[PDB]
Amino acid sequence: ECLEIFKACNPSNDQCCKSSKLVCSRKTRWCKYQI
Amino acid sequence: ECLEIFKACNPSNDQCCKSSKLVCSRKTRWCKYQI
Amino acid sequence: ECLEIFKACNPSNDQCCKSSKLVCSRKTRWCKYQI
Amino acid sequence: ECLEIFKACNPSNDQCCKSSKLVCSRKTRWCKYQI
Amino acid sequence: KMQKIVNHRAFTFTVIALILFNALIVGIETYPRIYADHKWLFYRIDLVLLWIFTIEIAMRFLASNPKSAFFRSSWNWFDFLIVTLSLVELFLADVEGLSVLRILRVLRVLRAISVVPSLRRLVDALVMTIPALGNILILMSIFFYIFAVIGTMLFQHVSPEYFGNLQLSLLTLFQVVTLESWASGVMRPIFAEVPWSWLYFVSFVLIGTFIIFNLFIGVIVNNVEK
Amino acid sequence: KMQKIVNHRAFTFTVIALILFNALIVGIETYPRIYADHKWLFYRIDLVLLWIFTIEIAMRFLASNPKSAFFRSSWNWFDFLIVTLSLVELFLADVEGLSVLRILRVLRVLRAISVVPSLRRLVDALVMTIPALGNILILMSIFFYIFAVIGTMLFQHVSPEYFGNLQLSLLTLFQVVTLESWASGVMRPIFAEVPWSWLYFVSFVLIGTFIIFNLFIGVIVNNVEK
Amino acid sequence: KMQKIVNHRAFTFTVIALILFNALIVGIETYPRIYADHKWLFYRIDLVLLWIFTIEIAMRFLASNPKSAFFRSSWNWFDFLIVTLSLVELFLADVEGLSVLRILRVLRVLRAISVVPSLRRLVDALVMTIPALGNILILMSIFFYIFAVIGTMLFQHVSPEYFGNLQLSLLTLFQVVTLESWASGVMRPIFAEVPWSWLYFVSFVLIGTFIIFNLFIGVIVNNVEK
Amino acid sequence: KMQKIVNHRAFTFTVIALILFNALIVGIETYPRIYADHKWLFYRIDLVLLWIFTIEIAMRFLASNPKSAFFRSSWNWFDFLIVTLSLVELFLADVEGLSVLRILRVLRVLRAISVVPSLRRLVDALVMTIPALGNILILMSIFFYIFAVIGTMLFQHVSPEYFGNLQLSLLTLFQVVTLESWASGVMRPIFAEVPWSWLYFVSFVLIGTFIIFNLFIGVIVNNVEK
Ligand SMILES: CCCCCCCC/C=C/CCCCCCCC(=O)O[C@@H](COC(=O)CCCCCCCCCCCCCCC)COP(=O)([O-])OCC[N+](C)(C)C
Ligand SMILES: CCCCCCCC/C=C/CCCCCCCC(=O)O[C@@H](COC(=O)CCCCCCCCCCCCCCC)COP(=O)([O-])OCC[N+](C)(C)C
Ligand SMILES: CCCCCCCC/C=C/CCCCCCCC(=O)O[C@@H](COC(=O)CCCCCCCCCCCCCCC)COP(=O)([O-])OCC[N+](C)(C)C
Ligand SMILES: CCCCCCCC/C=C/CCCCCCCC(=O)O[C@@H](COC(=O)CCCCCCCCCCCCCCC)COP(=O)([O-])OCC[N+](C)(C)C
């Protein structure tokens, strides 16, 4: 399952659900929104 | 006949009467005085 | 005779008496003192 | 014997006693301390 | 119900200490050597500081007449906006840095003016006395505009670096009212081509000064009197 | 008979809008790209503005005690002369531009000082307080003259660019009272040849300053008092 | 018992003469020619001066309420410390000169302010009126810090000579509040690369000035009033 | 017996006209073309002016209480000395010009301050208020001396053009209190070699300013009060 916002994502494997237009990052070591 | 001041003159054909020392121009598209 | 001070001297011929240590000039066209 | 502080030392022959860690100089022509 | 006296000298000095510490850390982080190494440490420090400031503003909000406005004080607005924009880096889009978010962390230092009573008291008047000027600012603006338009339309082809545009020359006219080599870098090289230019600068440097000077005197008989 | 109240807040704000619009248009027309293209449009706009300002001044004249002077107010004189000289481009000889008529269109903006009551009120005093200075201006003029003559007759052969003429050096002495590199561009290179010149500049820079400064203080005890 | 009146106009003027003579001698000794030759003479003069000043301070101490403090007057402290550090060259380690002891001999001249009653009276107020400023100094310090941090983190790679470090740029920001070619040496060459930099400088030069200026006015309504 | 009223508005205006005419002529004679040609005419004009001024001062002397002092007024002393030194060119040794006698003819213009009542009245106070300063001048002199000695003994080998001598650097310290490129021409190139020099200049520029500024305020609470 794809986690939402404020979720410890992975630099290599992006789990950021694309349904809510998200893009995992490494700066904050978690998932945030995309524009 | 030669028109006086404030008269829509022509850039090519100057109708500015020379009796009153006039010189037609194009800037204001009419006839004005000369000095 | 040699004239004293304030005397119309001559640029060529100096009449400035040397007894009173004088030297005729041309700037003021007369004789003045010397130091 | 080795003199202590404030003693007219010699530029060539240093009499500054080394027990009190002293070094004779020439600037003040006497013996002072060393650090 | 948060109706106890929770904000006293000790809490205020905790706040001040945190502000000074954030200032020190933002200062340090401007060294490349000292940064590359402890990057992680600096980032996590910043995170903790951000949270401890957010909860600070939150306590400030709640503990004091929540249903009441609380928004009268411009200061509280300042703190609010700073914390908001700084958090948005966490819950919004793409606002990493780009030479604009770090300025926010730095500006975070101004709260040192909000805390210290004397500083706030001073800045209050130092601001309120702007509308006192009012007109004179409009006069200087009109003069700047006139002189900028004229300088453009005249010297736009002789000195394209100082009077190239309506604004490129609005900058020259600003450097010339502070008197920075307006005679050795700005004018002396123009006055060599258009020989009647000595008017333009001289005239400006007089009027400009004459205006500025008077502004000065003004704000005196508005203060030294009372 | 034009004896009704035809000049009120609405009409004044129409006038102000027209002035601001002419300002904006004169600003824009200082861009070559934006000009070459819409040349005709700009010219015709200017024509309409000129007419709508002439009829403005005409209404101002007629509607208010025509047989009476109406010429007391220096301002009305200013507007009158501006509109006259700007119309003369239409009924006179050869006054196209020649880097002198456009300055008139620009100067047309100053009427923004005539309209706004506060601005007129301010400029009134800011002018009236010139004759207050009076003397000090004469003193500075005498000093400038003395120092310019001396600098000429002394350095006219060492620095022909700064002290070449009675006026070419009246400009140097002006750049040196504003303190623009008077020690690094004006003096330092002269002081290298005539070694006793350090007097001339130093002396000036003192007296000049001492004079200017006092002028300053003067206009304070003429204003801050009352 | 030293309880007679041993300090009167004559003794004070002896002290003043000695101070002026030490000033003259320290001035002279700054000429290499005049120094190499009479080295011995200069050194021995300095020795005698040092002793005659030490015994001076010693008399000052003893003759006036020894058991009493005598240390209230900051001045006596100044003289004391000067003489101490200057003697230490004789009874301590290695303190020949090294571009730091000679500054002490020179500073020895300031006692000319301690002796002359009017000078001491003046310096007293000229100092006491510093704490009056107080805040404004803190405000200027905060502003300097903010602007220095920002300038560093922004231009640290475009102008490494002016904004290279947190302090290397704390110097640029000082040269720019005095308005030394901040537009021709500091900004003009940066504004060529980062085109939005014109904000940074302009903003500074405004606020800075606006702050400084007000400080000025402040210290007036603190003095000209009373 | 010269006891009639021989000095009235008409005579005063004759004097003023003569002064202005001598001013104009001395101005003109500073043009080489206009001089070579009419040399004789200019010289004879100068002669007549000199005589008509000598007899002027002579009438002033005689007609007014000769046996009385008449020497109280410093002004009469000024006119006297000017006319004396200018005549001495006729009855003394070798004083043609040598870049020093012509300065006298020029200075002859200052009498325009003696004649005009308002100008004399103004200069009177503008001078009398110097002793008011007094101390502050001594303080600035002491500071200049200290800083000049230190700068010499420190930078005399790094910057021999600015700090070469006790006086060669007394000039640099004067150019640096007026803030002429003291950071771009004086310091920036030194600070590159002796890296701890940033103290010296900074410190100066602060104290110097702090002193000067206060002097300013001083002369205000000495005037604006009364
Ligand atoms: C009470 C009454 C108050 C009186 C006040 C009087 C003020 C009256 C106000 C007059 C308004 C001035 C009109 C400016 C016209 C600009 C339009 C333009 O052509 O821009 C050009 C670009 O260049 C720019 O980017 C424009 C930058 C804004 C101009 C800033 C000057 C503001 C003057 C205010 C001075 C304030 C004082 C100064 C000190 C603070 C665009 O043209 P282009 O380059 O050829 O490119 C093609 C167009 N394109 C880019 C769209 C594709
Ligand atoms: C009441 C409210 C207070 C107002 C204060 C607000 C500000 C007050 C006024 C501000 C405006 C000041 C304008 C500065 C003049 C600049 C002239 C210049 O140098 O350009 C040209 C001057 O051209 C000449 O030949 C000399 C003529 C002088 C022009 C005078 C303009 C009219 C001023 C009347 C103003 C009315 C004042 C009314 C104000 C009251 C020089 O270049 P050029 O001509 O090309 O020369 C040849 C070049 N070539 C070699 C390539 C051929
Ligand atoms: C109460 C008492 C008040 C006291 C005030 C004292 C003032 C006393 C007033 C003294 C008057 C000064 C006389 C100047 C003589 C100039 C004549 C001349 O030779 O010109 C030359 C050209 O050069 C020019 O074009 C002349 C420019 C005008 C001079 C401007 C200086 C005004 C000094 C005012 C300073 C004001 C203060 C400064 C700051 C505002 C012409 O000579 P030429 O080059 O060889 O060429 C051949 C001649 N030709 C050209 C005709 C063919
Ligand atoms: C009461 C009303 C207030 C008055 C205030 C108004 C202003 C007050 C005064 C204003 C005038 C100030 C004049 C500045 C002096 C400049 C000197 C200079 O540098 O030129 C020369 C100095 O020549 C020397 O040899 C040094 C002698 C000093 C000259 C002093 C002039 C007399 C000043 C008395 C004034 C009386 C003051 C009375 C005023 C009251 C330098 O060049 P040079 O000589 O060629 O050197 C060799 C060159 N060579 C290498 C090519 C050979």
Ligand SMILES: CCCCCCCC/C=C/CCCCCCCC(=O)O[C@@H](COC(=O)CCCCCCCCCCCCCCC)COP(=O)([O-])OCC[N+](C)(C)C
């Ligand atoms: C009421 C509240 C008041 C608000 C005031 C806010 C003030 C807040 C205070 C903030 C404090 C600022 C922290 C600076 C961190 C420096 C540490 C450092 O890295 O140094 C570096 C060297 O460089 C140096 O030598 C340091 C020089 C001292 C810095 C001077 C700036 C003072 C800022 C005050 C401005 C005052 C105003 C300006 C005008 C007077 C060391 O790092 P490195 O080079 O990589 O070498 C390896 C490390 N090593 C050297 C140890 C081996």
Ligand SMILES: CCCCCCCC/C=C/CCCCCCCC(=O)O[C@@H](COC(=O)CCCCCCCCCCCCCCC)COP(=O)([O-])OCC[N+](C)(C)C
């Ligand atoms: C209440 C107490 C009084 C406060 C007074 C204390 C001081 C007051 C404030 C002091 C701080 C002032 C900061 C100066 C701004 C500098 C901007 C700059 O030039 O850098 C960059 C601007 O980047 C841009 O793109 C333009 C955006 C403007 C930035 C505005 C910052 C926010 C200001 C809000 C402040 C809030 C004010 C609240 C204060 C109240 C330029 O470089 P770059 O971006 O890299 O450009 C491209 C470079 N390249 C070519 C390599 C790509």
Ligand SMILES: CCCCCCCC/C=C/CCCCCCCC(=O)O[C@@H](COC(=O)CCCCCCCCCCCCCCC)COP(=O)([O-])OCC[N+](C)(C)C
């Ligand atoms: C209440 C108390 C007041 C406190 C005030 C403290 C003042 C205390 C006063 C201190 C007096 C300073 C002593 C200077 C010694 C100079 C002697 C010398 O060696 O000259 C040298 C030449 O160089 C010169 O020509 C000398 C020029 C005069 C020096 C001017 C500085 C005045 C300092 C005042 C500053 C005033 C403030 C500045 C702003 C106005 C000569 O040496 P030489 O080159 O090797 O050549 C061989 C010698 N020979 C030339 C003879 C053959």
Ligand SMILES: CCCCCCCC/C=C/CCCCCCCC(=O)O[C@@H](COC(=O)CCCCCCCCCCCCCCC)COP(=O)([O-])OCC[N+](C)(C)C
């Ligand atoms: C109460 C009346 C008011 C007084 C106001 C009057 C004025 C107030 C004071 C005025 C005097 C101010 C002196 C300025 C300092 C200059 C230092 C400098 O730059 O030179 C050297 C600093 O050498 C160093 O190593 C740094 C040490 C700092 C020296 C501090 C001096 C003591 C100040 C205490 C003063 C006590 C204050 C007491 C005043 C009260 C730099 O050169 P260098 O060392 O050679 O460096 C290496 C060069 N190399 C590369 C070739 C190797």
Ligand SMILES: CCCCCCCC/C=C\CCCCCCCC(=O)O[C@@H](COC(=O)CCCCCCCCCCCCCCC)COP(=O)([O-])OCC[N+](C)(C)C
């Ligand atoms: C706005 C008020 C002005 C005042 C006027 C006063 C008298 C007016 C004086 C002269 C008037 C006319 C001068 C004759 C020359 C005109 C044309 C010309 O050729 O210029 C020439 C010189 O012209 C100058 O250098 C201007 C002199 C500047 C005076 C500044 C005094 C400041 C007053 C202080 C205010 C403080 C006290 C308060 C008093 C207000 C330059 O051109 P050129 O020589 O032919 O050179 C050939 C071209 N080339 C340069 C490329 C080589």
Ligand SMILES: CCCCCCCC/C=C\CCCCCCCC(=O)O[C@@H](COC(=O)CCCCCCCCCCCCCCC)COP(=O)([O-])OCC[N+](C)(C)C
């Ligand atoms: C107007 C009042 C003056 C004050 C005098 C004070 C003491 C007078 C001091 C010295 C007096 C005489 C100096 C001896 C040298 C004279 C001849 C000479 O050769 O000059 C030499 C140095 O001369 C200077 O550099 C001048 C020093 C400037 C002092 C400015 C102090 C400002 C006071 C601050 C006012 C604010 C506080 C208020 C106080 C008022 C230069 O020539 P040179 O060395 O031979 O070099 C060879 C030629 N070469 C240069 C091409 C290489």
Ligand SMILES: CCCCCCCC/C=C\CCCCCCCC(=O)O[C@@H](COC(=O)CCCCCCCCCCCCCCC)COP(=O)([O-])OCC[N+](C)(C)C
């Ligand atoms: C802080 C307050 C500001 C006021 C704003 C006022 C209006 C704001 C005006 C313009 C606003 C925006 C300008 C449009 C351009 C923006 C981006 C840009 O490209 O800049 C351009 C021009 O930009 C400038 O030159 C800045 C103009 C300086 C105005 C200073 C006025 C001082 C007010 C007086 C205060 C005293 C009175 C009191 C009033 C306060 C430069 O970049 P470029 O052209 O693309 O060049 C290409 C890159 N290159 C440079 C390497 C070649």
Ligand SMILES: CCCCCCCC/C=C\CCCCCCCC(=O)O[C@@H](COC(=O)CCCCCCCCCCCCCCC)COP(=O)([O-])OCC[N+](C)(C)C
């Ligand atoms: C007098 C009062 C001072 C205040 C201190 C404040 C904090 C003190 C800050 C720093 C203190 C010590 C700095 C650490 C470095 C020291 C040694 C050093 O190497 O210097 C270095 C930097 O040093 C500077 O650049 C000086 C910074 C100037 C501060 C001016 C602030 C004005 C305050 C505003 C007053 C208005 C508000 C009112 C507040 C009063 C330079 O040397 P380097 O980097 O090694 O370079 C190698 C050699 N090289 C240069 C040839 C390449």
